[PDB]
Write a protein that holds these residues in place. Sequence first.
Motif, PDB file in Angstrom:
ATOM      1  N   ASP A   1      33.800  32.012  50.676  1.00  0.00           N
ATOM      2  CA  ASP A   1      34.380  30.712  50.992  1.00  0.00           C
ATOM      3  C   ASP A   1      35.057  30.111  49.768  1.00  0.00           C
ATOM      4  O   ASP A   1      34.907  28.930  49.488  1.00  0.00           O
ATOM      5  CB  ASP A   1      33.311  29.738  51.528  1.00  0.00           C
ATOM      6  N   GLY A   2      35.785  30.936  49.029  1.00  0.00           N
ATOM      7  CA  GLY A   2      36.475  30.451  47.845  1.00  0.00           C
ATOM      8  C   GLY A   2      35.696  30.235  46.553  1.00  0.00           C
ATOM      9  O   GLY A   2      36.263  29.775  45.567  1.00  0.00           O
ATOM     10  N   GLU A   3      34.422  30.595  46.531  1.00  0.00           N
ATOM     11  CA  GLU A   3      33.590  30.443  45.340  1.00  0.00           C
ATOM     12  C   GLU A   3      33.120  31.801  44.851  1.00  0.00           C
ATOM     13  O   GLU A   3      32.527  32.545  45.611  1.00  0.00           O
ATOM     14  CB  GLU A   3      32.391  29.593  45.697  1.00  0.00           C
ATOM     15  N   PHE A   4      33.392  32.131  43.593  1.00  0.00           N
ATOM     16  CA  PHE A   4      33.007  33.433  43.024  1.00  0.00           C
ATOM     17  C   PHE A   4      31.493  33.541  42.723  1.00  0.00           C
ATOM     18  O   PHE A   4      30.844  32.527  42.511  1.00  0.00           O
ATOM     19  CB  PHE A   4      33.797  33.690  41.717  1.00  0.00           C
TER      20      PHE A   4
ATOM     21  N   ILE B   1      31.402  41.636  42.433  1.00  0.00           N
ATOM     22  CA  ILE B   1      31.993  40.371  42.038  1.00  0.00           C
ATOM     23  C   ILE B   1      32.651  40.011  43.369  1.00  0.00           C
ATOM     24  O   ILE B   1      33.498  40.756  43.857  1.00  0.00           O
ATOM     25  CB  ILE B   1      33.102  40.569  41.004  1.00  0.00           C
TER      26      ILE B   1
ATOM     27  N   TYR C   1      38.039  45.741  34.412  1.00  0.00           N
ATOM     28  CA  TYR C   1      38.078  44.484  33.671  1.00  0.00           C
ATOM     29  C   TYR C   1      36.640  44.023  33.400  1.00  0.00           C
ATOM     30  O   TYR C   1      35.707  44.642  33.877  1.00  0.00           O
ATOM     31  CB  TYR C   1      38.891  43.434  34.449  1.00  0.00           C
ATOM     32  N   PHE C   2      36.442  43.026  32.548  1.00  0.00           N
ATOM     33  CA  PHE C   2      35.081  42.560  32.283  1.00  0.00           C
ATOM     34  C   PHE C   2      34.885  41.105  32.689  1.00  0.00           C
ATOM     35  O   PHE C   2      35.762  40.273  32.504  1.00  0.00           O
ATOM     36  CB  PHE C   2      34.668  42.802  30.817  1.00  0.00           C
ATOM     37  N   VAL C   3      33.763  40.823  33.327  1.00  0.00           N
ATOM     38  CA  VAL C   3      33.454  39.473  33.749  1.00  0.00           C
ATOM     39  C   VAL C   3      32.166  39.105  33.035  1.00  0.00           C
ATOM     40  O   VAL C   3      31.309  39.956  32.817  1.00  0.00           O
ATOM     41  CB  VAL C   3      33.296  39.384  35.274  1.00  0.00           C
ATOM     42  N   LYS C   4      32.061  37.860  32.599  1.00  0.00           N
ATOM     43  CA  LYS C   4      30.884  37.417  31.894  1.00  0.00           C
ATOM     44  C   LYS C   4      29.920  36.807  32.905  1.00  0.00           C
ATOM     45  O   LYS C   4      30.286  35.916  33.675  1.00  0.00           O
ATOM     46  CB  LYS C   4      31.290  36.425  30.809  1.00  0.00           C
TER      47      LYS C   4
ATOM     48  N   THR D   1      35.454  51.465  46.131  1.00  0.00           N
ATOM     49  CA  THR D   1      35.050  50.637  47.266  1.00  0.00           C
ATOM     50  C   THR D   1      33.541  50.401  47.341  1.00  0.00           C
ATOM     51  O   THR D   1      32.738  51.326  47.221  1.00  0.00           O
ATOM     52  CB  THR D   1      35.597  51.190  48.591  1.00  0.00           C
ATOM     53  N   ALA D   2      33.187  49.130  47.497  1.00  0.00           N
ATOM     54  CA  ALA D   2      31.810  48.666  47.556  1.00  0.00           C
ATOM     55  C   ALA D   2      30.973  49.247  48.666  1.00  0.00           C
ATOM     56  O   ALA D   2      31.388  49.314  49.815  1.00  0.00           O
ATOM     57  CB  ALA D   2      31.776  47.160  47.637  1.00  0.00           C
TER      58      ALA D   2
ATOM     59  N   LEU E   1      34.242  36.767  53.203  1.00  0.00           N
ATOM     60  CA  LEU E   1      33.758  37.548  52.080  1.00  0.00           C
ATOM     61  C   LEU E   1      34.975  38.221  51.453  1.00  0.00           C
ATOM     62  O   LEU E   1      35.912  38.613  52.139  1.00  0.00           O
ATOM     63  CB  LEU E   1      32.718  38.584  52.552  1.00  0.00           C
ATOM     64  N   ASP E   2      34.965  38.334  50.139  1.00  0.00           N
ATOM     65  CA  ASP E   2      36.061  38.957  49.435  1.00  0.00           C
ATOM     66  C   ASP E   2      35.486  39.640  48.204  1.00  0.00           C
ATOM     67  O   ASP E   2      34.987  38.987  47.299  1.00  0.00           O
ATOM     68  CB  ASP E   2      37.055  37.876  49.031  1.00  0.00           C
ATOM     69  N   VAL E   3      35.481  40.960  48.217  1.00  0.00           N
ATOM     70  CA  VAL E   3      34.953  41.728  47.109  1.00  0.00           C
ATOM     71  C   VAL E   3      36.093  42.080  46.144  1.00  0.00           C
ATOM     72  O   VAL E   3      37.120  42.621  46.553  1.00  0.00           O
ATOM     73  CB  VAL E   3      34.236  42.977  47.643  1.00  0.00           C
ATOM     74  N   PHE E   4      35.919  41.735  44.869  1.00  0.00           N
ATOM     75  CA  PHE E   4      36.916  42.008  43.842  1.00  0.00           C
ATOM     76  C   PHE E   4      36.617  43.203  42.935  1.00  0.00           C
ATOM     77  O   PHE E   4      37.385  43.476  42.028  1.00  0.00           O
ATOM     78  CB  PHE E   4      37.155  40.761  42.985  1.00  0.00           C
TER      79      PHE E   4
END
Lengths: 108, 108, 108, 108
Positions: free
Chosen positions: D60-63, D56, D21-24, D48-49, D94-97
């Motif tokens: 703590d809930g903030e991208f 991305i 997918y693409f993120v700006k 996997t990172a 931490l949450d890597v997307f």
Amino acid sequence: DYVEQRIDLNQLLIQHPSATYFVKASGDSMIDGGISDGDLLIVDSAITASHGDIVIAAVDGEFTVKKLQLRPTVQLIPMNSAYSPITISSEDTLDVFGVVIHVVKAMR
Amino acid sequence: DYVEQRIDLNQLLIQHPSATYFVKASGDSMIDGGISDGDLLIVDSAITASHGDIVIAAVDGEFTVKKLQLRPTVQLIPMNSAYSPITISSEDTLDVFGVVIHVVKAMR
Amino acid sequence: DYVEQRIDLNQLLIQHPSATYFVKASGDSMIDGGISDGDLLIVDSAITASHGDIVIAAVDGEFTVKKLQLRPTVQLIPMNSAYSPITISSEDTLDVFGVVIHVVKAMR
Amino acid sequence: DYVEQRIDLNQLLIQHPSATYFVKASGDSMIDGGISDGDLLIVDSAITASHGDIVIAAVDGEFTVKKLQLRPTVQLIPMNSAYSPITISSEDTLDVFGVVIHVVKAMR
């Protein structure tokens, strides 16, 4: 004798633990929905979004927490009279990352 | 490689797990406060109630979720313009069972 | 000469004063047990509930005064032929807040 | 005679199309890395990172789009001398997307 079953919020609130995460709400575009700046949105990505569900999505590479509208047309609509809907036409890209299942409001 | 640290709501939301329990909100005497009928109120009984705190209390043997007011007089006040405050005079008995720390609203 | 030892209900009825409180009974789910709408239930929270004891408990966030049954299975059973038992399975949360030791019926 | 094989950016740039997918990109916390405000980040969530990868992630809930550092400690570090690193301690989530594989800069 009686045994106190200690509280476990994961069992109570989370169905698919391996696909559940939390996003912090931003701004007030969803206040009428009960979502306010700062709140924790518990998001489940193992469930498929439906008309009416509040989702974490990316429209043209930009993330947002909005209400999914599939009928009469696909749209991302807020829950604040001051904000305007977002139509998802063919030149636009919608990407749903999960359905918000609970909102956690802090009180102190 | 990187390993994902699964979400744990108890660590995030609960401080004293041995004295934390959940009560389900009733009616709408506390809607302006964000508490609506059906919501889960996460209650901590290990912390002592202060002026302004929303508490689970029993007034003359009847339970309620209200906002504690110690000044200018001890009262249990709602957060709905349609409901009226409860004064705790000497002939009345107040009993606080814990402070509401979080409200969990469901979004389905 | 004789000295009249004035009546003291706390000494007579309350064992653990620092953990005793009173809850007002509601409805008639416990009438055969002698508990009727309006009566005062003197509750002791310093004693551990046993099979047969009448307790103040919260099942899934909702309070009730019921008879605790631990054998053959954990259940909260009424004392009115018209009401049905409540089973406490693993998806349910039982929370006992104290054992009713006395019932105070008013007469006028 | 010879027949021209038209350009196909998906075949050239995307490996796992079902998870890409693409993120700006936002702000300039990653300019030294070549990522500037407005650019499209092509993200692959099927890989996997690793240490050094630009990911991305949600802290703590903030991208945010940052460079993953697993050694000596887990951190999210920018690529702009004016911004400071983010440590991911135990109280943080931490949450890597997905890993950024390409940056598409527009020239108009």
